Antibody
Framework: QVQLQQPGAELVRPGASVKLSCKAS????????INWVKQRPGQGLEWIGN????????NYNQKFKDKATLTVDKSSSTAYMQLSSLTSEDSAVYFC?????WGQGTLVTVS | DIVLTQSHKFMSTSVGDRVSITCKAS??????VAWYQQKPGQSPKLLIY???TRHTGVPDRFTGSGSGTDFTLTISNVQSEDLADYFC?????????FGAGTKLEL
């Protein structure tokens, strides 16, 4: 039913920025908070922050606040997240999620 | 910053057995705890929320329990399809945090 489509992978150059997309479909885009989660093979899951589509209100992890920016595009029902000054430590799988539904994730590889 | 410490990193067992994974919070989170199941190369799947409520689709085999600071995930009759990673998450206050995970192997 609900679907949070994320592109499979992203190859990025060290020190640059990356824009990750998350297209929601099958439910009212504005009534549910969208969270962004980071996953690196070695460690657990890490919450980056969230955004409420209706008014773009955001909460960020103190660890990721200036490093990431969260926005939405209510007309296309897409949520975006941008990371800058990328380094090897940012290579991981990033997932966008809402209650009960996680996207497939996007593998960001800095090389 | 609420820390979530899962008992073990790995746990062995074979089909038929009963397993219990524990999650201890460093602060009281009432019952605002969720458990996820994650198989390799896939995204996490919600199992339990509000400490003991089963989500639409999870089998009666899974049972959550606890409150305050001690939570537990219980699989009464471990089937092969249950071999995977299990995470607990807190959603009472920011930042939202997860446990390190517990791998279920044969």
């Amino acid at each position: 039913q609900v679907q949070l489509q994320q592109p499979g992978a992203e190859l990025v150059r060290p020190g640059a920025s990356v824009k990750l997309s998350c297209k929601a479909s099958g439910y009212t885009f504005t009534s549910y908070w969208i969270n962004w989660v980071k996953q690196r093979p070695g460690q657990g899951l890490e919450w980056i922050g969230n955004i409420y589509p209706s008014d773009s209100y955001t909460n960020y992890n103190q660890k990721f606040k200036d490093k990431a920016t969260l926005t939405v595009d209510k007309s296309s029902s897409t949520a975006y997240m941008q990371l800058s000054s990328l380094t090897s430590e940012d290579s991981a799988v990033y997932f966008c999620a809402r209650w009960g539904y996680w996207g497939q994730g996007t593998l960001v590889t800095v090389s | 910053d609420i820390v979530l410490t899962q008992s073990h990193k790995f746990m062995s067992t074979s089909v038929g057995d009963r397993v219990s994974i524990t999650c201890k919070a460093s602060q009281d989170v009432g019952t605002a705890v969720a458990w996820y199941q994650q198989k390799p190369g896939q995204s996490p799947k919600l199992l339990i929320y509000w400490a003991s409520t089963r989500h639409t689709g999870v089998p009666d085999r899974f049972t959550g329990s606890g409150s305050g600071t001690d939570f537990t995930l219980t699989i009464s009759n471990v089937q092969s399809e249950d071999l995977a990673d299990y995470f607990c998450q807190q959603y009472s206050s920011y930042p939202l945090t997860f446990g390190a995970g517990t791998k279920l192997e044969l």
